[PDB]
Amino acid sequence: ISGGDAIYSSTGRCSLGFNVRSGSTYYFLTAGHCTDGATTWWANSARTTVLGTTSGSSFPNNDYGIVRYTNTTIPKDGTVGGQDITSAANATVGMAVTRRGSTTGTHSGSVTALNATVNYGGGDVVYGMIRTNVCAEPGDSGGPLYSGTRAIGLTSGGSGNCSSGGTTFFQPVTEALVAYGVSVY
Amino acid sequence: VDCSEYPKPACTXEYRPLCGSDNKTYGNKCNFCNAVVESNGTLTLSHFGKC
């Protein structure tokens, strides 16, 4: 399994952000709004292939979560689809980025702004978000935002769609990596 | 599903489908509710889950 692939909780479907590790412990990052109130994660809609369990969740304010792998045999590729990821970096205005999600697949665009505040309502406000002109749709939450071999962010939310075009906000992945003391590979 | 607090400038995403009266499957409640607003209240919920 790799970045952009579908992941299922008891509630719905999201996308795996990045496979990360700490020592010999493997986890995966995804959106906080997906990990919020979720315990177990599966690789299929049938819920027959277990992935692991939620180890951390930060939403709102931020939008990241981490899941500890309990499945010992499933391949945990340090890639996004077939794209190798070798490091993480900070987003910059004008940067060319690519997103992969379980619903829309791969779409590209650029970073148009930093430190954006997004109000999802009901007191669900996230801060310090990366704004881009990449589209995304339901099911794409938590999928990776990358640039070449560099991990940049996790899909948090947006408006519009891939047909008419849209705006998508991402949580900087650097902050998540530091919070959990994990690193991409 | 109540769309009173809509519209919203953005939605998270997660996939938890709803079926609208237009036979379109909406990815989640926020998407569905923004579409109801856009339809000026003509779109309604048919059932939960995909169409």
Swiss-Prot record, chain A:
The keyword Signal applies. It catalyses: Hydrolysis of proteins with trypsin-like specificity. GO terms for cellular component: extracellular region. Disulfide bonds join 14-34, 135-162. The active site is at 33 (charge relay system), 63 (charge relay system), 141 (charge relay system). It comes from the Bacteria. One of its GO terms (molecular function) is serine-type endopeptidase activity. GO terms for biological process: proteolysis. Its EC number is 3.4.21.81. Keywords: Disulfide bond, Hydrolase, Protease, Serine protease, Signal, Zymogen. Has a primary specificity for large aliphatic or aromatic amino acids. Monomer. Belongs to the peptidase S1 family. This is Streptogrisin-B. It comes from Streptomyces griseus. The lineage of its organism: Bacteria, Bacillati, Actinomycetota, Actinomycetes, Kitasatosporales. The chain holds residues 115 to 299 of 299 of the full protein.
Swiss-Prot record, chain B:
Disulfide bonds join 3-33, 11-30, 19-51. Glycans are attached at residue 40. It is found in: Secreted. The record marks 13-14 as: Reactive bond 3 for chymotrypsin, elastase, proteases A and B, and subtilisin. Residues 1-51 form the Kazal-like domain. Avian ovomucoid consists of three homologous, tandem Kazal family inhibitory domains. This is Ovomucoid. The chain holds residues 135 to 185 of 185 of the full protein.
